[PDB]
Amino acid sequence: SMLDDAKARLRKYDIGGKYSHLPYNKYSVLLPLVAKEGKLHLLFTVRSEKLRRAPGEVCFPGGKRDPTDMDDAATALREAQEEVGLRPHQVEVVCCLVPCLIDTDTLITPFVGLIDHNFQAQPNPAEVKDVFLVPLAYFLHPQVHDQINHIFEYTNPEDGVTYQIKGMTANLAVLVAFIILEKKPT
Numbered sequence: 001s002m003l004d005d006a007k008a009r010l011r012k013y014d015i016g017g018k019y020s021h022l023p024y025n026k027y028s029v030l031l032p033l034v035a036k037e038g039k040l041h042l043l044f045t046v047r048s049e050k051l052r053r054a055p056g057e058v059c060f061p062g063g064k065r066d067p068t069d070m071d072d073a074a075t076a077l078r079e080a081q082e083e084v085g086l087r088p089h090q091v092e093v094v095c096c097l098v099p100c101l102i103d104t105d106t107l108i109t110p111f112v113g114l115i116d117h118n119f120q121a122q123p124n125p126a127e128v129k130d131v132f133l134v135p136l137a138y139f140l141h142p143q144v145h146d147q148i149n150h151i152f153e154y155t156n157p158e159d160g161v162t163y164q165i166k167g168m169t170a171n172l173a174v175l176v177a178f179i180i181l182e183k184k185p186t
């Protein structure tokens, strides 16, 4: 099946816990894969305008590890629940992708999760202004705008709303698109 196939592709890029013990400032993100209408999509958040860090920008759910977290995956799952109401029984964590090094002292670990078909997002308005889906195939032929810095524009055909996707978020999205969709019969 489509889901069987996705998970088998993702498994081959799993680094697991290899870089998890290093002495960084530690954050995790969850990349949430949703099946709709015969196709895979990624779920994104728009950050609330009131936050200190990057108000109004597009990102994956996530945040800073805390002493309660059993491991780095736990951080991503805690944060996803708090931000958009995703419960643990509604997600299968499939792998841990390459971590992102920033600012000389910080390591951000991305996890890919398959989302239950009955999940409906309940955004916490203190953290998240909006939630939207993008088909995964979009990231193979995106609409690119140079700010020089590459920025993607995605227009939701349901309501005509345009979102800007950039930085680490845009990089991770293209990576997941390549892993799952490259080299497939039609």
Ligand SMILES: Cc1ccc(Nc2ncnc3[nH]ncc23)cc1
Residues within 6 Å of the ligand: 053, 054, 057, 058, 059
């Ligand atoms: C998409 C996105 C989400 C959060 C941030 N946060 C930060 N940006 C800059 N410096 C920071 N220091 N601690 C956090 C932090 C940046 C981008």
Ligand SMILES: Cc1ccc(Nc2ncnc3[nH]ncc23)cc1
Residues within 6 Å of the ligand: 027, 028, 029, 059, 060, 061, 062, 063, 064, 102, 103, 106, 108, 168
């Ligand atoms: C220095 C620094 C530290 C943390 C971040 N955080 C994030 N960066 C990107 N997406 C994110 N989603 N949730 C959090 C988060 C960015 C920069």
Ligand SMILES: Cc1ccc(Nc2ncnc3[nH]ncc23)cc1
Residues within 6 Å of the ligand: 003, 004, 005, 007, 089, 090, 091, 092, 114, 115, 116, 117
């Ligand atoms: C809540 C939730 C629980 C489990 C899954 N996983 C799968 N579901 C169906 N087929 C699959 N094939 N590989 C994995 C997989 C998705 C969401």
